[PDB]
Design a protein around this ligand. Sequence first.
Ligand SMILES: Nc1ncnc2c1ncn2[C@@H]1O[C@H](CSCC[C@H](N)C(=O)O)[C@@H](O)[C@H]1O
Ligand SMILES: Nc1ncnc2c1ncn2[C@@H]1O[C@H](CSCC[C@H](N)C(=O)O)[C@@H](O)[C@H]1O
Ligand SMILES: COc1cc(OC)c2c(c1)C(=O)c1cccc(O)c1C2=O
Ligand SMILES: COc1cc(OC)c2c(c1)C(=O)c1cccc(O)c1C2=O
Ligand SMILES: [Cl-]
Lengths: 319, 319
Amino acid sequence: SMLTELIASNRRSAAIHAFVDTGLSTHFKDGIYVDISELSRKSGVNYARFSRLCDFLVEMGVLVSNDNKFRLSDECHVFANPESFESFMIKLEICSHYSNAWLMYGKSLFEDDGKSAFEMAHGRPFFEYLDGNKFLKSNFDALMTRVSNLIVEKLLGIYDFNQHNRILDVGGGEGELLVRISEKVKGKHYAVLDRYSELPVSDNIDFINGNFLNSIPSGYDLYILKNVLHNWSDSDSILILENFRKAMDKNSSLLLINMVKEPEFSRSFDILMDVLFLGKERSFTEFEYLANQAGLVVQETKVIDQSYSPYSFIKLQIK
Amino acid sequence: SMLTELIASNRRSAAIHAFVDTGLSTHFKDGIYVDISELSRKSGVNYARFSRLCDFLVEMGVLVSNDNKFRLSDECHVFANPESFESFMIKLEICSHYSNAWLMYGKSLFEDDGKSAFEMAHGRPFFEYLDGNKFLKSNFDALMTRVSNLIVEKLLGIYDFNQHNRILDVGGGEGELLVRISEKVKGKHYAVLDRYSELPVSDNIDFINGNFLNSIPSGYDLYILKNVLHNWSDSDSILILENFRKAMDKNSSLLLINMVKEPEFSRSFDILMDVLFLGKERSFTEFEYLANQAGLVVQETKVIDQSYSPYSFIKLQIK
Ligand SMILES: Nc1ncnc2c1ncn2[C@@H]1O[C@H](CSCC[C@H](N)C(=O)O)[C@@H](O)[C@H]1O
Ligand SMILES: Nc1ncnc2c1ncn2[C@@H]1O[C@H](CSCC[C@H](N)C(=O)O)[C@@H](O)[C@H]1O
Ligand SMILES: COc1cc(OC)c2c(c1)C(=O)c1cccc(O)c1C2=O
Ligand SMILES: COc1cc(OC)c2c(c1)C(=O)c1cccc(O)c1C2=O
Ligand SMILES: [Cl-]
């Protein structure tokens, strides 16, 4: 039926995970047709049982069956690349920590202690827990780096970064965004603020160990906050934007860049942000409200089309 | 995109789980429109955060939204009933034990020890592990009971049970099938064989602690094996049917009743059987082959339509 297979939606994620996490998908590069019997003899995977997985991947539209062989669909070519953001996504999506967080989601809706389903499961908030877990941190930081890399060319196209002198990326992670921006926009001061136990090292990048809940460093004319606010509540989001306003002068600009809530696209990510952070994916209207409460003004709004989600580009200045 | 939401299929299962497992769905009985504002005040669930879950349930088609009120869809009325098989399904579907089994599925394809992904995760095969886990056993046995209670009406309609005298349901669990048959077909001897640490109790039902891998007891003219063989390999399936042939005389009949693999329906269940049991969902042809290898003859075959899956009804007698 439609209901029982909807209940069994997890099986689709788990099937893809088995195919990608093992590295079996990396044998399907450049849309080649793979003989499963030969792949079985080479990789030492069970032929009969992997053939049944491939049949389910064909049903999902991940594989295509022709000439008694299988190729990745045009869309699913990314699964052949273990460096792709999709490879890191599935590795996190149904990992034990995420799964155990989802199992506390129901109970978390009845609590008023400000503890996420993740924290209820693991005993710390997401980012504080990642400090002690290499698997979660490395794979998450990798995912953020890959999606940062994808939007760079689009972001440089719609806004002039050359007019600016000193640029700070707040919660910039490994600092991929500014590293790629600096290669095309030379002769600027580049800084990246995040939570570092050991400062990253990159040519002409000033890596800052800071806390955007406490303070943002002043004396930059361009600030960037990309995919941060949907990890935070309304009050924490206002506190962050308030710290920007206190750091910014009249000439300063803040580029608030976020995966934006649009009715056409799935609410699934909005729920994931609730489970992991007690966060939420916000519309343009909700982002504008929080900015106004912090004493910031919207001077420019654009929509950036990415494969996986639409993005809201919001240029903020002090009132 | 379609690919990232296919990767994130697990979020659909986890959302339904949080809605049903908490018992919030039990407030949506008889297709009534629920005020989330009132349900929040009454049950103590977070209004804003549950309203967001409801929006995701509307997207999935589980809920219908009209004038800022939510009702269960005609199809998902079952979620209002905690005794429904769908309620038990989701509670098992993404439970930690199933999730941890799925995480070993990839690695299990490279092993050849006859150990399921579940056994690799938990250290014991499924049913042996259920002996020491009441949560899994009680919910699994409850699920098998609910689906047994659904098919009884159609099964009585297509086969004359009144011709028989002594009836044994092999691997009959809580014995729901025969209890329901015995109410409509009176004056017979009814027996249920399964693995019991303590024998269940029901009026005019002889519960037997047995092992169908070792032996099936002789002296019955009707044998029933319903949804057993897809927990077993081809060799173990043959061993079970061989034990039937040894137990049966020329006058005996075996009813092999199973969810049947048809090309129109999903392969997702076939993969679940591999993960949990190293089992498989078989076609009519594959079932007939195993019976022929065991020394049994097919007298009569029929298809029984159930909401969630088609069933293969196969009447067998000895060669
Ligand atoms: N209190 C805090 N102070 C500074 N950075 C924080 C923080 N809490 C979380 N972060 C960082 O916020 C980031 C959110 S993920 C976004 C990373 C990057 N801006 C990108 O778009 O790809 C993580 O790198 C996390 O380490
Ligand atoms: N070795 C064994 N001997 C007997 N029963 C067994 C067994 N291994 C598993 N079983 C039982 O086989 C059943 C599979 S589930 C099917 C239950 C029932 N026939 C129905 O259709 O609803 C479980 O009740 C399990 O306890
Ligand atoms: C910062 O919080 C996030 C947290 C996130 O998940 C915990 C994500 C993302 C952000 C995210 O940007 C993203 C983009 C594309 C695919 C994804 O799976 C994600 C994503 O999972
Ligand atoms: C005995 O092995 C099973 C094992 C099973 O799962 C472990 C199931 C079933 C059988 C099963 O029959 C079933 C029917 C309808 C919905 C279901 O989720 C199931 C099911 O999960
Ligand atoms: Cl008796």
